[PDB]
Design a protein around this ligand. Structure first.
Ligand SMILES: Nc1nc2c(ncn2[C@@H]2O[C@H](COP(=O)(O)OP(=O)(O)O)[C@@H](O)[C@H]2O)c(=O)[nH]1
Ligand SMILES: [Mg+2]
Lengths: 125, 428, 243
């Protein structure tokens, strides 16, 4: 970690470095490592939309319902940006849908606050 | 108020710009050679606006940092008609970075563009204004475009600045820094352009998918709707009409407040690429399909906001009296969705010449407060990435301070709040 | 004054890889070359050498990038160095040093980014505090009649700044008085009657800041040619303006 708490896994999962992720995880890098803001490598992977990274993170036991300082879970971030394939994979690994951020808007309240007709279909199917 | 200088910047700018010049050159009876082969004289009545005299050449400037689209346009069907000297294309690209186009490598090329801009302006009897096509989610059209706007603004402070800005969406391009670029670009258009047509790609995609029933829409499927919409909103400018003749008269009728100059265009009927839709829709149909959300080029529900000003343009031989009855009806039957404190805010024009392929068409231009939904959508994606400062090193590495992101985010939310402010104002 | 400080010498510190780098087709080279001499040579000093040092060679390479460089980033860091020079070199910009940067700063007031307009104005203020109205007065009036609306409002605001801190030497008949109505009040009226509102708003202040210095009855003659409306916006600032 540095002055922010970011690990090589955070930054590899953020900027789509799959080969760097698979290697760090083979040699035992903490998947649930949080930075100073509570962001896990799964948070940043769901944010940028690296599907292959999101699955590899989960396959090593990634906390799928972790919360950062702002109260967002990887399901919130995969939804706000519209990475629908990642939205599915999270739910298929037990992503809780009722998580409320500091503002109180859940995953379904974000599919509504932006009128995402695509997301509303998957979010309850 | 006569001649209009057209500019296309970036990948998307030169794409929809070349497709727009194909459309109007045909409507004005101009073949790729530049010669006139039309029949009616109304085509040549106001050809001086977009074209120059030859021995007809478009008054268009083509800009991009990447020379890729330079050759894709010249290899196009109408690529031989543009002036060779009007191609201003740099060496390196923009990498879909607003800061590279606006601050770094676009500023190194912008002086070359203003030299071509000046050239086309000196040969104008009376320059009416400028017209820009670009994408807000890109790097060159977003970054270098807003720089070109602010540069033209300081050199031509008396001319209208009009833009055709397309909005990024996850349903099309998968680049994640597009909310950054669009937020930084909207932060410029709100303070530099006199009028801006919002062309949402999420709306264009939903139209090709849910209305034209195309499973996998391509950019040609999307740019077909853009060229049709651009041809309609420019009809009154190139054909001898009475209402909204020049750029300023249109802006004086459509922009009640300076920052609220973001228009929600519509068009009917929604045709496909080379399909069969012969039967010219009736006037009551053209009016119903004009005022719906399924024909808006912007992902906003007009039911969620109020229309400040409205400009409707009908094309084709039809009963002008039957048009007034319909345009009156939709107003007094949906009076809650029209601002009371602006009397006669809806204005309808008629043009005898239809677009090539149809007998009756109708183009909608609305200054609705529902356009805040579009900015709310972009502002949500912007903050989601910005809270984690993802990819910020792109823009800081090109000189931008982190504060510039906070300001552009703040001014966009101010623009949203203002659109809500007049959505709640009453008459009493 | 606390200006008994030892004058340090900084014209030696300039590395050989500078005049080549500051004249490069790569923006990074020009930005880094200006920034290093700003942060490492000009920043950690407070009193420069007034004698046996000709900074005019360095000042004109700053004006070249201020006026002509397209990289707005370098324009900012270069104008800051000008402000630092004339600050740390009190009573140095007699004529050549003051004029080598004045008109490039006025021309570059076109830039609208607040950080850049802040840097160029603060340097224009710093060159004015040591050259009150040498070239400034005569040269500032020229750029209030410039074609660009942005350089009109900024050069007009800049006169108000110098006009505010106008203490002169006295007793009377200074360069301002003999140009009061022949040129100065005429250039201000063009701003007062500009087509744009924010521009006129600058001239309203600038006119009211002028009536603050010279008796308000002395300028009642050009006041009557003005609209009764423009008279109330001018009297508006007269209550707020002082010095
Ligand atoms: N409708 C439409 N949108 C486009 C087209 N090309 C690019 N875009 C959009 O523009 C954005 C990328 O900007 P682009 O023009 O490629 O980068 P630029 O060259 O720096 O302006 C993406 O979000 C795309 O959705 C096009 O042909 N049609
Ligand atoms: Mg692209």
């Amino acid at each position: 970690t540095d002055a922010s708490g970011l690990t090589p896994l955070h930054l590899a999962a953020t900027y789509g470095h799959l080969e760097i992720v698979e290697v760090l995880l083979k040699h035992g890098a903490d998947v649930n490592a949080i930075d100073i803001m509570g962001s896990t490598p799964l948070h940043l992977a769901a944010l940028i939309g690296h599907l292959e990274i999101v699955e590899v993170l989960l396959k090593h036991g990634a906390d799928v319902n972790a919360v950062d300082t702002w109260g967002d879970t990887p399901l919130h971030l995969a939804a706000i940006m519209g990475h629908l394939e990642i939205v599915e994979v999270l739910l298929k690994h037990g992503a809780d849908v009722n998580a409320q951020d500091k503002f109180g808007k859940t995953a379904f309240d974000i599919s509504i606050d932006n009128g995402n007709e695509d997301l509303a279909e998957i979010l309850q199917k | 108020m006569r001649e209009i200088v057209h500019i296309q910047a970036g990948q998307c700018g030169n794409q929809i710009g070349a497709k727009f010049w194909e459309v109007i050159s045909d409507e004005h009876g101009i073949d790729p050679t530049g010669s006139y082969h039309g029949d009616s004289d109304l085509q040549l009545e106001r050809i001086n606006v977009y074209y120059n005299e030859a021995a007809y050449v478009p008054r268009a400037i083509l800009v991009d940092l990447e020379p890729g689209t330079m050759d894709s346009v010249r290899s196009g069907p109408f690529g031989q008609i543009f002036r060779p000297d009007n191609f201003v294309f740099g060496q390196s690209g923009a990498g879909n970075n607003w800061a590279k186009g606006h601050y770094t490598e676009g500023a190194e090329l912008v002086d070359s563009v203003l030299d071509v801009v000046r050239k086309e302006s000196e040969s104008c009897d009376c320059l009416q204004g400028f017209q820009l096509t670009h994408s807000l989610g890109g790097g060159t059209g977003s970054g270098m475009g807003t720089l070109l706007i602010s540069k033209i603004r300081e050199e031509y402070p008396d001319r209208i600045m009009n833009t055709f800005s397309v909005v990024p969406s996850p349903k099309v391009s998968d680049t994640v820094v597009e909310p950054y670029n669009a937020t930084l670009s909207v932060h410029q258009l709100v303070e530099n352009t006199d009028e801006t047509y919002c062309i949402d790609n999420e709306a264009l995609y939903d139209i090709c998918f849910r209305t034209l029933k195309l499973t996998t829409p391509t950019y040609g499927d999307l740019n077909h709707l853009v060229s049709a919409t651009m041809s309609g909103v420019t009809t009154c400018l190139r054909f001898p009409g009475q209402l909204n003749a020049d750029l300023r008269k249109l802006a004086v009728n459509m922009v009640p407040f300076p920052r609220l100059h973001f228009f929600m265009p519509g068009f009917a009927p929604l045709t496909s690429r080379g399909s069969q839709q012969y039967r010219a829709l009736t006037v009551p149909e053209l009016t119903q399909q004009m005022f719906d959300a399924k024909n808006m080029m912007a992902a906003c529900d007009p039911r969620h906001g109020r229309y400040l000003t409205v400009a409707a343009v009908f094309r084709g031989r039809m009963s002008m009296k039957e048009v007034d009855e319909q345009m009156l009806n939709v107003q007094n039957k949906n009076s809650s969705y029209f601002v009371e404190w602006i009397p006669n805010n809806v204005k309808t024009a008629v043009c005898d010449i239809p677009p090539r392929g149809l007998k009756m068409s109708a183009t909608f231009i609305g200054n609705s407060t529902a356009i805040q939904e579009l900015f709310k959508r972009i502002s949500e994606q912007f903050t989601a990435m910005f809270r984690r400062k993802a990819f910020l090193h792109w823009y800081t590495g090109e000189g931008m301070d982190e504060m510039e992101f906070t300001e552009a985010e703040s001014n966009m939310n101010d623009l949203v709040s203002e659109y809500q402010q007049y959505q709640d104002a009453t008459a009493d | 004054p606390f200006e008994l400080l030892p004058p340090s010498v900084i014209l030696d510190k300039f590395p050989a890889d500078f005049q080549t780098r500051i004249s490069s087709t790569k923006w990074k080279d020009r930005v880094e070359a200006l920034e290093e001499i700003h942060n490492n040579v000009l920043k950690p000093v407070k009193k420069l050498a007034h004698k046996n040092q000709d900074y005019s060679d360095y000042l004109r390479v700053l004006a070249n990038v201020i006026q002509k460089d397209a990289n707005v980033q370098a324009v900012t860091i270069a104008a800051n160095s000008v402000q630092l020079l004339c600050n740390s070199l009190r009573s140095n910009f007699t004529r050549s040093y003051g004029a080598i940067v004045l008109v490039p700063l006025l021309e570059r007031t076109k830039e609208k980014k607040p950080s850049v307009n802040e840097a160029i104005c603060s340097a224009l203020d710093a060159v004015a505090t040591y050259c009150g109205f040498d070239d400034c007065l005569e040269e500032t009036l020229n750029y209030m009649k410039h074609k660009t609306p942005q350089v009109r409002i900024e050069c007009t605001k800049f006169l108000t700044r110098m006009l505010q801190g106008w203490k002169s030497d006295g007793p009377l008949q200074n360069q301002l008085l003999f140009k009061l109505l022949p040129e100065v009040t005429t250039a201000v009226l063009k701003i007062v009657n500009d087509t744009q509102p924010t521009t006129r708003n600058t001239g309203f202040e600038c006119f009211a800041t002028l009536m603050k210095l010279v008796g308000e009855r002395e300028l009642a003659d050009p006041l009557e040619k003005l609209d009764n409306l423009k008279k109330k916006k001018i009297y508006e600032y007269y209550e707020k303006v002082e010095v």
